[PDB]
Design a protein around this ligand. Sequence first.
Ligand code: FE
Length: 698
Amino acid sequence: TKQAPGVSIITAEDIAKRPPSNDLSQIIRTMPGVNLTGNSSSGQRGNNRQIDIRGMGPENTLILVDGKPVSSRNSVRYGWRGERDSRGDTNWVPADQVERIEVIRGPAAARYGNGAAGGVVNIITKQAGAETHGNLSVYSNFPQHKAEGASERMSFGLNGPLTENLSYRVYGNIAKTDSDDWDINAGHESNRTGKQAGTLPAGREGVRNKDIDGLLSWRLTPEQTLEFEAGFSRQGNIYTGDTQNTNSNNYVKQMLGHETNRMYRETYSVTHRGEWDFGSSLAYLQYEKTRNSRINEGLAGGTEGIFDPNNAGFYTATLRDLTAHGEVNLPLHLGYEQTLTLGSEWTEQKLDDPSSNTQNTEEGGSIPGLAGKNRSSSSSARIFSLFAEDNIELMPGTMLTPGLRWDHHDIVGDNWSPSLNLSHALTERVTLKAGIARAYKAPNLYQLNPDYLLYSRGQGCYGQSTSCYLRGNDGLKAETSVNKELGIEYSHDGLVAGLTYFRNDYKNKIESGLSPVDHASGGKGDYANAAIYQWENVPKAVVEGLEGTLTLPLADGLKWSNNLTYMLQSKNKETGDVLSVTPRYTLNSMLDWQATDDLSLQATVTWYGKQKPKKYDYHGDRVTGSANDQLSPYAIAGLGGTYRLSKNLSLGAGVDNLFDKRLFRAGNAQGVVGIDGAGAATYNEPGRTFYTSLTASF
Ligand SMILES: [Fe+3]
């Protein structure tokens, strides 16, 4: 099936029947245990939501394409409140060239190591067969309300042999998601007075995509396959007024409807695959080079994450990420039947960011050990990793899987991530699964870097009103999490009923600090001798909830599917505030009718529970008025169909959000001077939207 405890498959056929506008987050987020959330609780860049597994935040969600990491978002400045002005890393592969998506949550994902603390999303592409095939896929949606941005998408694939031992596969995508109108949130905004009167919290940023991938497979012997692939992708946005704090200036307005960030992503990969008697082998080299070109922003207080009109123009941040991986897999025959996997991994992240490191110390006064001007643009970390998984058959139908991962991070030091995964047949229809693993999170190159320096005159300083600096800290420990999960599943004649409890005990979550470690010397007026905070390790945090799935065959042609997320707890145990903001629950419900041999029909309902904002502001003081606002439970219904015209041509058509339930970003979560908070009202939910699709394939 598509749902075991801790794991979900999305198939090409699923993607086809619930087409995404553009980004895959749309369909990935409907898996149990998965939300579409910001990383922390500020609501900053709140229309830029990314995949979150079990409320661990999206920085703890590792995105792979065919087993190879995507790290491109690590090229976007990481801000004071743990958000990047990034659309995430699930929009690099076009929907219609995906074979399947694998989502691995909690203890079963730790084995993947750095940044799999929430879990892994592996986006798997269609490959060549024994013959040549190819496809041409087009999708086009049509919002009821014009304010909301429509999406258009055209991709092709082409795959097959060249020789007896030479296979290839190529695809290309062109797509565009129009931005929401600059004024979509007008009349819904938080109360804005004085200087900030007239300001608006923005709708969804638009994106233009260009994706080209080529792969050559070379199986130069019976037991030896060698793969070369290159990826060229380009996302340029369509700006619609978004700023960190929802303030505006003149440069912002000048740029409405213009490209203000472009990401170029280049991937080259060498992969050798072995199969012989003793067992299996895999090793790969990926070089990911990301260029993040965007308009200079300020790094101080209310000027953090607005276009800086004193330093107008684009800079380019450059991420060179290098990944090499080796695994062999061994069948073994002993007192217990088993399979042993042995592996090394090596990664290098070089970040050149010529803008992030430029906050100067004149106003707050200077910081011993930090040069106020011409600090290095450069950050880097290498992790070396060794691991062995043992997949032990005790008695047929029962598997015990212990694995040890050891990682050497060249700054933070040594990590030991042990794991144990049990699956037990209690019956031929019932399976119990238990798992406890310690997953691993390396500090990001922003958190780690003593040259990375933000400033506030007070409004963003914890436990005071005075000026303060926030500073990078190479003294940081890595974040570790003991992800526990206990689950049970009945599966028989496509009847599936399962429920999982998960608890992740979260140690040394990295976060803007609560106590000054120091005070600077000198600078201007009341702002002089500002307090110094660094990126700190929070001792303890907890997430806890329930994943459920229930699939009933109503009739032979008719299938009723349901996935449930219920979030019990999400607590920073130091401040007692929430980590993420997620709906209390999420129920996704599909009815799938095979109405003919040729016609298939789909009704879907998604129910979102209550959403509560953070209780405390940047000061650590309790928020008041509209900063407390919660979002009521709501549902989104949709109908669709796919009418097969020939083995060569299929048409799709449907309506997302049938009953036109809409939500509007009112701003960030808390109040600032002149800008009331918006609590949980931090994102735009789009209204009724018609769509059509056409897929031609040999
Ligand atoms: Fe300020």
